[PDB]
Design an enzyme around this catalytic site. Structure first.
Site, short mmCIF file in Angstrom:
data_model
loop_
_atom_site.label_atom_id
_atom_site.label_comp_id
_atom_site.label_asym_id
_atom_site.label_seq_id
_atom_site.Cartn_x
_atom_site.Cartn_y
_atom_site.Cartn_z
N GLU B 20 69.40 -80.95 7.84
CA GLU B 20 69.08 -79.90 6.87
C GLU B 20 70.25 -79.57 5.94
O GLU B 20 70.41 -78.43 5.51
CB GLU B 20 68.60 -78.64 7.60
CG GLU B 20 67.60 -78.93 8.71
CD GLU B 20 66.53 -79.92 8.31
OE1 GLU B 20 65.80 -79.65 7.32
OE2 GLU B 20 66.40 -80.96 8.97
N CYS B 83 87.87 -80.91 17.13
CA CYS B 83 87.96 -81.96 18.14
C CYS B 83 88.15 -83.32 17.48
O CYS B 83 88.12 -83.43 16.25
CB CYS B 83 86.72 -81.97 19.03
SG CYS B 83 86.42 -80.42 19.92
N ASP B 126 70.07 -78.16 22.59
CA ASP B 126 70.36 -79.33 21.76
C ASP B 126 71.51 -80.18 22.31
O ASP B 126 72.39 -80.60 21.56
CB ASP B 126 70.67 -78.90 20.32
CG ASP B 126 70.68 -80.08 19.35
OD1 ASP B 126 71.27 -79.94 18.26
OD2 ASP B 126 70.09 -81.13 19.68
N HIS B 130 76.25 -86.19 20.32
CA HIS B 130 76.89 -85.62 19.14
C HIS B 130 77.28 -84.17 19.37
O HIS B 130 78.06 -83.60 18.61
CB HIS B 130 75.98 -85.74 17.91
CG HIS B 130 76.01 -87.09 17.26
ND1 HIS B 130 77.15 -87.87 17.21
CD2 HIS B 130 75.05 -87.79 16.61
CE1 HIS B 130 76.89 -88.99 16.57
NE2 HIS B 130 75.62 -88.97 16.19
N1 ADP Z 1 84.41 -79.25 16.01
C1 ADP Z 1 84.26 -80.49 15.46
N2 ADP Z 1 85.31 -81.33 15.32
C2 ADP Z 1 85.17 -82.55 14.78
N3 ADP Z 1 84.00 -83.04 14.34
C3 ADP Z 1 82.86 -82.30 14.42
C4 ADP Z 1 82.94 -80.95 15.00
N4 ADP Z 1 81.69 -80.45 14.96
C5 ADP Z 1 80.89 -81.38 14.41
N5 ADP Z 1 81.59 -82.49 14.08
C6 ADP Z 1 81.02 -83.72 13.47
O1 ADP Z 1 80.00 -83.38 12.52
C7 ADP Z 1 78.83 -84.18 12.75
C8 ADP Z 1 77.58 -83.38 12.41
O2 ADP Z 1 77.43 -82.26 13.29
P1 ADP Z 1 76.14 -81.30 13.14
O3 ADP Z 1 76.07 -80.91 11.69
O4 ADP Z 1 76.19 -80.25 14.22
O5 ADP Z 1 74.92 -82.30 13.47
P2 ADP Z 1 74.90 -83.15 14.83
O6 ADP Z 1 75.61 -82.27 15.83
O7 ADP Z 1 73.43 -83.30 15.12
O8 ADP Z 1 75.64 -84.42 14.48
C9 ADP Z 1 78.90 -84.62 14.20
O9 ADP Z 1 78.42 -85.96 14.37
C10 ADP Z 1 80.36 -84.54 14.57
O10 ADP Z 1 80.92 -85.85 14.59
MG MG Z 2 78.10 -81.88 16.35
#
Ligand code: ADP
Ligand code: MG
Ligand code: ADP
Ligand code: MG
Lengths: 386, 386
Positions: B20, B83, B126, B130
């Site tokens: 989204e 992270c 969820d 990921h």
């Molecule tokens: N705290 C974080 N540190 C580093 N990378 C992140 C973090 N949170 C999310 N990401 C990256 O952003 C991407 C998209 O996350 P999100 O928008 O929540 O959709 P999804 O969790 O379904 O991938 C993830 O694949 C992840 O690699």
């Molecule tokens: Mg994520």
């Protein structure tokens, strides 16, 4: 809110698209339009594509993009405000009301799909939602329009259920992907709510392992046979065997009764003949067989039996001679007895339906096979070929 | 250099893309670098009254941290522990290294952080590769795992296709059970180096709605794979009520070290000497065979060991209890046993316990399940919970 020349209402939502996209009902310049807000980091607009259409001849069934504009976080696009999508035209109540029949709708979408391709423009996301129902225009009529071309997802592909199998093997790719989707849509309209793959959750999965299915089409009706041999040609796993958009238009699927009767006629005139024994004649006799229902002299009506009984001449287990007999009785129609014209005709509708409803596979069988002469001037109306 | 103080972030530094239109960048909150997720209010709503519950109780080592949330005109931002990667890169990236921690304790950590959520009555909704994150090297070099993206609600359908429990697509309000299911898939996903139970890209959610399940990577004769299977197939249970709570998963032999298992056999034996047998408890661990014993366990043991307990006694041979009993006793005086007997058995307590476990791949599993009548008892608290 405003960006000028648009200008839309904050909470007048038309619906929700993918990747955060949102469409509102807005104004431009003073008329009512639809405003589609996109995230530039998600969707990439194709200015060089929309430019090509702008400077070329306008097509009735390809929607218009009045203008584009941006702010800090979004990109905006003003698009003709339509009444609904094909999904509401197929799945909804007693619709409104309708205006055009399903077949003409299919034709219009195809013309548009051939228009884009003529400018090297692959939609790569054709589906019930990207086919719009226009508002009652002037006289109260309604036509259909393709939209959402020029937009292309990114990441730092179309909609599940309508994606071509090759797309998922690995980056564009070609128009042949639109035909697949169109193929699926063709069935969707005709089956009145069914997909060839066909339930949403495992839909795209069935697409990948070729799990087709066209139940709603009867195996021994003229109408359904014509459609089946086309749809399945368009949803071909192998992209190499999918018809172009121009070919689809030239398909018997869109022919009227009189044109069906004309093709039958030309073919006869074309095969009279050479060896039989001849590359051509063999082709239309190869299928035989059951197309003729074993013997066609036995499945035609009584008065007609007596008439052509006078010769001689007409094999009965031969497709070619069935075509010859039809031509013969078409050409000599006025000179025949009253009892013969009374079961046969009238011309041209009833006449062609007379052989069409007794020999469901005749037209289909003949169209294929006769492709050997698709490069000939006489058959240009029927094949296109390119 | 975008600023929505307290939160800041520089676009172009995009880390990932979410559903989204969700975007994730590198950023700053105080003096430390954080991750900024920009969601559309029209697509995702944030649960503040949950992220605060976490705030009350002391931080969990394996739960992500939410530093602050703030809004602008058009978006909503969230600051999270920056992270290094997701569980996906851990598993699928061959040549990942170090990999710092071990996969099983990866799974342990994840289940813990999960149990922490459910204690606060927070349902994740969820869980997936990921949403399980690998922290960066902390100081010396140690790496840990963290669950993320809890407290996010999708605005029309929770979760991600291919990790959603079946009871959430029939619809006619999620509880903790839905998370166990997802965990179960992830467990297997990690154990099998990247396969899914349901078990391939496009049709894994369909296979979930019909109860597929295929844990091919688990060998029915390997003692390890048997324990993993008893648990993993109890997590992805079609019936939610048959899935263990996050805490039960932690107490499972799947996480037990070698010596802890031996102490569990020793504990079980010492505990049954005894009621009759003729005894509610003893009847229980005898029920399942026979088959666990392989008809006669005296027949499936090494040669020098047979000699040692050939004249005893007492040692039924078709009895599970007596199989455990013989292991306990050969330990209780392992010190005094001969030479060729201590050799085929020990050393203690590792190789000793594997001697019996590899020859009876259903022993530990069978016992642990049969000996659940004493879950509450204080001898078996390190093993059960309940
Ligand atoms: N705290 C974080 N540190 C580093 N990378 C992140 C973090 N949170 C999310 N990401 C990256 O952003 C991407 C998209 O996350 P999100 O928008 O929540 O959709 P999804 O969790 O379904 O991938 C993830 O694949 C992840 O690699
Ligand atoms: Mg994520
Ligand atoms: N030009 C238009 N006129 C009227 N409604 C539209 C128009 N374009 C889009 N919509 C509505 O907005 C919805 C979302 O469109 P879009 O963002 O392209 O996603 P999708 O087409 O994949 O649903 C569509 O389902 C459609 O009903
Ligand atoms: Mg649309």
């Amino acid at each position: 809110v405003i960006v000028g020349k648009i200008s839309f209402c904050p909470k007048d939502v038309l619906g929700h698209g993918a990747e955060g996209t949102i469409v509102y009902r807005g104004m431009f310049d003073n008329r009512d339009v639809a405003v589609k807000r996109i995230l530039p980091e998600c969707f990439s607009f194709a200015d060089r594509e929309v430019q090509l259409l702008r400077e070329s001849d306008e097509h009735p069934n390809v929607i218009r993009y009045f203008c584009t504009e941006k702010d800090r976080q979004f990109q905006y696009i003003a698009i003709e405000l339509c009444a609904a999508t094909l999904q509401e035209y197929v799945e909804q109540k007693d619709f409104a009301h309708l205006g055009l029949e399903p077949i003409t709708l299919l034709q219009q979408t195809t013309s548009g799909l051939a228009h884009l391709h003529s400018l090297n423009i692959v939609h790569r996301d054709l589906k019930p939602h990207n086919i719009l129902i226009s508002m009652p225009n002037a006289h109260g009529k309604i036509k259909a329009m393709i939209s959402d071309f020029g937009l292309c997802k990114k990441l730092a592909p179309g909609t599940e259920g309508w994606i071509a199998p090759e797309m998922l093997s690995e980056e564009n790719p070609t128009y042949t992907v639109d035909i697949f989707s169109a193929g699926c849509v063709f069935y969707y309209v005709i089956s009145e709510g069914s997909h060839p793959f066909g339930k949403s959750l495992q839909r795209q999965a069935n697409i990948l392992l070729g799990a087709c299915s066209l139940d709603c089409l009867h195996p021994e009706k003229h109408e359904d046979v014509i459609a089946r041999e086309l749809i399945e040609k368009m949803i071909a796993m192998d992209p190499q065997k999918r018809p172009s958009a121009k070919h689809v238009l030239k398909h018997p699927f869109f022919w009227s009764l009189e044109k069906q009767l004309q093709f039958f006629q030309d073919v006869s005139d074309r095969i009279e003949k050479e060896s039989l024994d001849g590359p051509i004649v063999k082709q239309l006799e190869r299928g035989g067989r059951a197309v003729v229902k074993m013997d066609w002299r036995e499945n035609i009506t009584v008065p007609l039996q007596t008439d052509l009984r006078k010769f001689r001449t007409y094999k009965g287990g031969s497709v070619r001679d069935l075509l010859r007999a039809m031509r013969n009785k078409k050409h000599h129609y006025r000179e025949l007895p009253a009892e013969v014209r009374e079961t046969l005709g009238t011309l041209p509708d009833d006449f062609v339906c007379y052989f069409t409803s007794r020999f469901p596979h005749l037209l289909a069988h003949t169209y294929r096979a006769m492709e050997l002469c698709s490069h000939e001037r006489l058959f240009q109306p029927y094949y296109f070929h390119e």
